[PDB]
């Protein structure tokens, strides 16, 4: 079932913007610092403006997912995925798009020694993070969140200040991976019941009390490492301190 939205400004273009920025930068010589900097900054700014337009066309009367649009995975069409936002996720997309250009601006003076690798990593982070905030599926949420670990690992380990960044990046990656794996176990548990992982559907399926408790504990373990909650909060100090400022 194709759910393509009628709106000109949709989620797909906002997703594509930083992807296009990253693909363009891979081919530009590191000797061209002025061009690399301006391309990255302009791409991030355009993304922020697009998110503001997405705010403009928002309906505050509906409880239905807005700007809903679908993307097909197989020609069997058994597994079909959806993008949509609501009143809960719109502002997080806008915040992501606002913070990324700030991160590009923070390392403006040191971009001679950073390079395209610095701007590319932050743009890929932006694209993955917006995707995560825009998903109506448990499975794609897992993939795109689990994917954010690679660029954050690189950002901490390469542009961190001291040698403690090694331990910090290790702890970050491993804690987050453990939590994500627990979420994956919960997503397969749900799939075995439902036959699908679509949010709009699972919102309409009743879960037994015992299975509700067990599914909650697996979802809890994943989310509580990222909150963070005691006692799995100790990765955050080393990770956040050892990272570069934009990181």
């Amino acid at each position: 079932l194709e759910h393509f939205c009628e709106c000109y400004f949709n989620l797909s273009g906002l997703i594509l913007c930083p992807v296009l920025g990253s693909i363009i930068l891979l081919f530009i010589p590191n000797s061209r610092i002025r061009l690399i900097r301006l391309i990255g900054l302009c791409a991030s700014l355009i993304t922020f403006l697009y998110s503001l337009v997405l705010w403009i066309q928002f309906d505050s009367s509906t409880a239905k997912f807005q700007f809903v649009e679908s993307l097909r995975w197989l020609p069997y069409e058994n597994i079909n995925f959806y993008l949509g936002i609501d009143g809960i996720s719109l502002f997080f997309v806008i915040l992501t798009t606002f913070l990324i250009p700030i991160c590009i601006l923070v390392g403006w003076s040191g971009m001679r020694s950073y390079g395209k690798e610095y701007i590319i990593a932050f743009l890929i982070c932006e694209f993955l993070m917006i995707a995560v905030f825009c998903m109506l599926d448990l499975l794609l949420f897992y993939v795109f969140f689990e994917s954010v670990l690679i660029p954050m690992f690189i950002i901490i380990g390469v542009w961190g200040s001291r040698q403690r960044k090694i331990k910090a990046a290790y702890q970050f990656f491993l804690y987050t991976l453990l939590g994500s794996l627990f979420m994956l176990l919960a997503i397969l548990l749900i799939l075995f019941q439902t036959g699908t992982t679509d949010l709009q559907i699972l919102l309409t399926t009743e879960f037994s009390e015992r299975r509700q408790i067990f599914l909650w504990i697996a979802f809890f373990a994943s989310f509580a490492v990222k909150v963070p909650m005691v006692p799995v909060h100790i990765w955050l100090p080393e990770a956040h301190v050892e990272a570069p400022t934009a990181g």
């Binding site: 900097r37 403006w108 003076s109 971009m111």
Partner: protein, 56 residues
């Protein structure tokens, strides 16, 4: 007697320390005074850098 002096001193010091006024007077600009460290003269050897953080 030199050892009597040590005991007379030690007894004396503890006396002062026991009946010392709990709120002694201090000249205002002296350490612990009410004017101490108020608008002190700036230290020498301070440099202010201009044009920091340029893109080039």
């Amino acid at each position: 007697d030199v050892d009597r002096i040590d005991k007379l001193i030690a007894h004396g010091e503890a006396e002062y320390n026991k009946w010392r006024h709990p709120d002694p007077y201090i000249v205002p600009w002296a350490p612990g005074g009410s004017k101490f460290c108020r608008n002190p003269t700036p230290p020498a050897g301070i440099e202010i850098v201009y044009n920091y953080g340029l893109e080039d």
